Amino acid sequence: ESADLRALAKHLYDSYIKSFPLTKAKARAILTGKTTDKSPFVIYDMNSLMMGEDKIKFKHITPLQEQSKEVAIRIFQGCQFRSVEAVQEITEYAKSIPGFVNLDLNDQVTLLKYGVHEIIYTMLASLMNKDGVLISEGQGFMTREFLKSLRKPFGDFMEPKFEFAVKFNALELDDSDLAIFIAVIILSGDRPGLLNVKPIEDIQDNLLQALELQLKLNHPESSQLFAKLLQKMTDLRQIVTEHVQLLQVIKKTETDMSLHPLLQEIYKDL
Amino acid sequence: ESADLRALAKHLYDSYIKSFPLTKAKARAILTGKTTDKSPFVIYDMNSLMMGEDKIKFKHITPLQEQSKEVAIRIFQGCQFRSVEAVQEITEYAKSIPGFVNLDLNDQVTLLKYGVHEIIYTMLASLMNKDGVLISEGQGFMTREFLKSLRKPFGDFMEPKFEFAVKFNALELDDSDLAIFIAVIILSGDRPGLLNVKPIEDIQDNLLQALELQLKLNHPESSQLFAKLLQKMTDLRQIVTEHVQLLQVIKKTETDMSLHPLLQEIYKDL
């Protein structure tokens, strides 16, 4: 019955809006400068970053950066912190997925473990366009160029993010679509360590059905968007890897730099 | 048109049948499946490997284990020769796909370049079971346990393929199913260096519609099988990424050998 799958879709979309403060729709309204009811401050260089606090609340070194906790490090920890923020929202959203909280606690954890980062990059896309990404809840916009020019290492951490964002956004999915896709990602079943694989696959099959009908119904003219979207799932895996290793490099070349334990936790390499 | 998609399917099935000698139907009958009208020589130890390579039809090397080209290497060189044969069979099959030969030649090359590995591992699954893989046109069977007890480097080579094969074959796809799946993999559109993506995706979109109807008619009670098969494509992607990796590692083992040149060519890299 397509009727029960539309109800699952509505349920998920409803929860999604409740768990993520900045929707893609609000993101695009902000990025498409035509809608100027409140526009973002743009950080495109060391000078813009400096004043990026005069107006926007950035509890981070406004002045000199080098000998005083360099800019590259601060920007990084800024995203680091933004990631944990997302991990808590994604975690809250996951609890609303029917069947999820009834799964063995150990698997719920495993599902969140590997799913979170793939979800963070999918949703990060919503705040991006070829030239940059929205920051501080959309109050700001940091350029893709400014980020590409930071300290040797920290200069290629966001690049593969925009690469993915670019091709992912070309699909033109909206929040109602993303809510089901994100749900699908959390309930994989091919994660390492899962104790009870069947119960997870059964829920995912239902989510898969919901997503299929949803796309068929919201993008009637987009042939095979469903197949197209499922494959992007490999681009996500590659980003996580590159990120984890580039993360290990900072680990030993910046021993004075810390990493949030939540992120450090969902971070069991390999 | 339903009939149109049914025509594309039987056509790919027929081409598949003529390009690929050993069918999964044929391989299944041999493997775990009883059907004893011709049994394979089982290679489960070094002795059986010697007492087999000097008896099984293998036009390359022979039993040589002791200061005479080690076993792990001889076996490695064997799957290389096998993989190179598989490339020629996959190539002929691609040409049978409607629209493929109409594409810009450079693109045709690109699609095969980055597609043959994913295809090779997909069809390898058909020759595998949780215990081993059929060898030599199906005249042999090399145990999984044996392949994993090889020299440090070579002992982790086939395992990640068995893991994949085990999960993949669970979907119980037959040859008419696979014929379309492979065609879909070939016409990706997201391969690096492609000059004209539109026609490629139009064709794959046509191929995806044919696989979909095929899975629905051939597996009416197999729910969301279509979505599950597509999610396995990323599984292929990873295996490929991991393979070329452990491979580059081998590069730092077998190298400078003034007699390998004309053979190094034949096996370039892919």
Answer whether B73's CB lies under 8 Å from B80's CB. Answer: no
Cα separation, A217 vs B118, whole angstroms: 32
Contacts A209 to B, Cβ<8 Å: 223-224
**In units of Å, what resolution does this entry have?**
2.2
Residue A261 Ramachandran class (φ > 0 left, ψ -120 to 50 alpha, else beta) = alpha
Q: Which residues pair with A192 in a beta bridge?
A: none
Residues 225-244 in B contacting A (C-alpha not used; CB under 8 Å) = 226-228, 230-231, 233-235, 237-238, 241
Residues 9-68 in A contacting B (C-alpha not used; CB under 8 Å) = none
Task: Tell me whether residue A136 is exposed, middle or buried, using C-beta atoms within 10 angstroms of its C-beta: 0 to 12, 13 to 18, 19 or more.
Answer: middle
Cα separation, B197 vs B107, whole angstroms: 9
Answer whether B12's CB lies under 8 Å from B96's CB. Answer: yes
In 3D space, the residue among B68, B67, B65, B69 whose CA is nearest the CA of residue B46 turns out to be: B65
Cα separation, A62 vs A80, whole angstroms: 19
In 3D space, the residue among A136, A119, A125 whose CA is nearest the CA of residue A19 turns out to be: A119
DSSP structure class, residue B39: P
| The pair of three-digit structure tokens given for residue B159, joined into one six-digit string | 């395992």
Answer whether A173's CB lies under 8 Å from A13's CB. Answer: no
CA distances for B131 relative to A115, B31, B58, B158, B214, angstroms: 31, 10, 22, 12, 30
Residue A210, phi then psi, degrees to nearest 5: -60, -45
Task: Tell me whether residue A52 is exposed, middle or buried, using C-beta atoms within 10 angstroms of its C-beta: 0 to 12, 13 to 18, 19 or more.
Answer: buried
Answer whether A176's CB lies under 8 Å from A214's CB. Answer: yes
DSSP structure class, residue B40: P
The edge-to-edge listing of strands for the beta sheet with A128-129 is: A41-43, A140-143, A132-135, A128-129
Cα separation, A151 vs A160, whole angstroms: 17
DSSP structure class, residue B122: H
CA distances for B232 relative to A177, B121, B144, B167, B237, angstroms: 21, 11, 22, 9, 9
Answer whether A75's CB lies under 8 Å from A147's CB. Answer: yes
Cα separation, A23 vs B57, whole angstroms: 62
**Other C-beta atoms lying within 10 Å of the C-beta of residue A196:** 12
DSSP string, chain A: -HHHHHHHHHHHHHHHHHH-SS-HHHHHHHHSTT--SSPPEEE-SHHHHHHTTTSS---S--S--STTT-HHHHHHHHHHHHHHHHHHHHHHHHHTSTTGGGS-HHHHHHHHHHHHHHHHHHHHHHTEETTEEEEGGGTEEEEHHHHTTSSTGGGGSSHHHHHHHHHHHTT---HHHHHHHHHHHHT-S-STT-S-HHHHHHHHHHHHHHHHHHHHHH-TTSTTHHHHHHHTHHHHHHHHHHHHHHHHHHHHH-TT----HHHHHS----
Answer whether A90's CB lies under 8 Å from A120's CB. Answer: yes
Q: Smallest Cβ distance to B233: which of A208, A212, A231?
A: A231
Residue B205 contacts A where some CB pair is shorter than 8 Å = yes
The edge-to-edge listing of strands for the beta sheet with B140-143 is: B41-43, B140-143, B132-135, B128-129
| The pair of three-digit structure tokens given for residue B52, joined into one six-digit string | 């087999």
Cα separation, B56 vs B50, whole angstroms: 10
What is the SS3 assignment for B132? strand
DSSP structure class, residue B158: S
CA distances for A245 relative to A33, A117, A152, A239, B251, angstroms: 36, 14, 15, 10, 22
Q: Smallest Cβ distance to A224: which of B205, B235, B237?
A: B205
Most B CBs within 10 Å: which of A206, A216, A230, as the mutation test of the B interface? Answer: A230
In 3D space, the residue among B194, B190, B236, B187 whose CA is nearest the CA of residue B209 turns out to be: B187
Cα separation, A72 vs A250, whole angstroms: 11
Contacts A205 to B, Cβ<8 Å: 223-224, 228
Q: Are strands B128-129 and B41-43 parallel, antiparallel or unpaired?
A: unpaired
Cα separation, A163 vs A200, whole angstroms: 31
For B1-270, CATH gives: 1.10.565.10
Answer whether A65's CB lies under 8 Å from A71's CB. Answer: yes
| The pair of three-digit structure tokens given for residue A39, joined into one six-digit string | 């526009």
CA distances for A87 relative to A92, A116, A169, A269, B52, angstroms: 9, 6, 22, 18, 55
Exposed e or buried b per residue across A215-252, where buried means at least 16 C-beta atoms within 10 angstroms of its C-beta: beeebeebebbbbbbbbbbbbbbbbbeebeeebeebee
| The pair of three-digit structure tokens given for residue B11, joined into one six-digit string | 């056509």
Q: Give the residue carrying structure tokens 């394979």.
A: B40
Technique behind the model: X-ray
Cα separation, B16 vs B97, whole angstroms: 10
In 3D space, the residue among A169, A188, A24, A171 whose CA is nearest the CA of residue A115 turns out to be: A188
DSSP string, A98-127: TTGGGS-HHHHHHHHHHHHHHHHHHHHHHT
Q: Give the residue carrying structure tokens 């022979």.
A: B62
Cα separation, A14 vs B255, whole angstroms: 59
Cα separation, A231 vs B13, whole angstroms: 24
H-only helix segments in chain B: 2-19, 24-30, 46-53, 71-96, 105-113, 116-125, 144-148, 159-169, 175-186, 197-218, 225-250, 261-266
Q: Give the residue carrying structure tokens 């809250």.
A: A92
Contacts of B29 (CB under 8 A, 6+ apart): B35
Cα separation, A213 vs A216, whole angstroms: 5
Answer whether A206's CB lies under 8 Å from B207's CB. Answer: no
Quote the Cα angle for A240-B185-B87, to 5°.
110
Distance from CA of B78 to the nearest CA of A (A): 29
DSSP structure class, residue B156: G
